[PDB]
Amino acid sequence: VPFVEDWDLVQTLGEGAYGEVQLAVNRVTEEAVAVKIVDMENIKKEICILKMLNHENVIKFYGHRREGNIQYLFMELASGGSLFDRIEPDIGMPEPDAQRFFHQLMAGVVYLHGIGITHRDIKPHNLLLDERDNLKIADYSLATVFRYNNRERLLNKMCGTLPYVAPELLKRREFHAEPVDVWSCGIVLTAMLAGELPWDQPSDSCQEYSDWKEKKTYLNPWKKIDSAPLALLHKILVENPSARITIPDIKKDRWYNKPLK
Numbered sequence: 001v002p003f004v005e006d007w008d009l010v011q012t013l014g015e016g017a018y019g020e021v022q023l024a025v026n027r028v029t030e031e032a033v034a035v036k037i038v039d040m041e042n043i044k045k046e047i048c049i050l051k052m053l054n055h056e057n058v059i060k061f062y063g064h065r066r067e068g069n070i071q072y073l074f075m076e077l078a079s080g081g082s083l084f085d086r087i088e089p090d091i092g093m094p095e096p097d098a099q100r101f102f103h104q105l106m107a108g109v110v111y112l113h114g115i116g117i118t119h120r121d122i123k124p125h126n127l128l129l130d131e132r133d134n135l136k137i138a139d140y141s142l143a144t145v146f147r148y149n150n151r152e153r154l155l156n157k158m159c160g161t162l163p164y165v166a167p168e169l170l171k172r173r174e175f176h177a178e179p180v181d182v183w184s185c186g187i188v189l190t191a192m193l194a195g196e197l198p199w200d201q202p203s204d205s206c207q208e209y210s211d212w213k214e215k216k217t218y219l220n221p222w223k224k225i226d227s228a229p230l231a232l233l234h235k236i237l238v239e240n241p242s243a244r245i246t247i248p249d250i251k252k253d254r255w256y257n258k259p260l261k
């Protein structure tokens with residue numbers, strides 16, 4: 001059919017880590033997608049990981065086109081925007097909405113980890129919503145392979161966003177990839193339930209992080225959180241990554257399995 005390969009760039013959806021994201025509409029079909037435009041090693045890695053992704057809670061990759069210097073990465077659009085924009089400052093969101101998003105985030109993260117990929121920058125800006133409020137993990141710029149031929153490799157590069165980063169990445173030379181992603185899902189959950197981040201970074205000099213280690217849950221944000229989701233947070237936000245809860249065990253948690261509105 002003539003013209004089915006042409007896309008109109010309609011509006012900017014934002015600037016991400018590397019380059020702008022635009023809404024693109026097919027001239028023939030009217031299909032609406034997102035395109036990441038990059039004016040170009042790093043991005044050969046991203047494309048490679050992006051082509052692996054096939055899951056309902058992960059942004060799908062439709063292909064790429066190079067036009068001289070510029071690369072165009074075509075991806076599933078999430079017409080509902082970001083989870084960041086559903087979180088009300090100082091309030092968060094209703095507990096049942098947060099639970100459903102949490103279930104969907106774990107499903108995506110289980111998937112990634114099962115194909116041996118770690119995302120490394122989980123936060124509400126990178127968690128996108130489709131038309132039915134289904135959550136999708138987006139942005140694979142920092143993602144990397146942590147398991148290959150059934151052998152794990154330890155990570156050593158420090159990246160992410162400080163309020164979301166696990167404390168081992170500030171303290172240790174090398175660390176396991178999976179508990180880092182788990183930890184960040186815990187900060188996300190805290191943000192959904194309280195509408196605020198518990199600390200600037202999880203270090204020994206941050207008084208809010210010390211308070212948490214001393215169990216001062218009569219302070220904010222913890223005071224705003226019901227005891228059941230808080231008991232789960234107590235198992236996620238554990239400083240020793242070897243003692244931190246894993247995802248199979250999160251799936252057995254009582255709040256995780258609680259029926260809610």
Ligand SMILES: Cc1cccc(-c2cc(Nc3ccn(C)n3)nc3[nH]cc(C#N)c23)c1
Pocket residue numbers: 013014015016017021034036059075076077078079080081082125126128138139
């Ligand atoms: C990480 C990031 C940064 C900027 C834009 C996007 C982004 C925003 C979006 N939908 C919408 C709908 C409405 N707004 C504002 N945004 N859909 C997407 N699908 C893949 C994306 C990617 N990367 C992406 C993602």
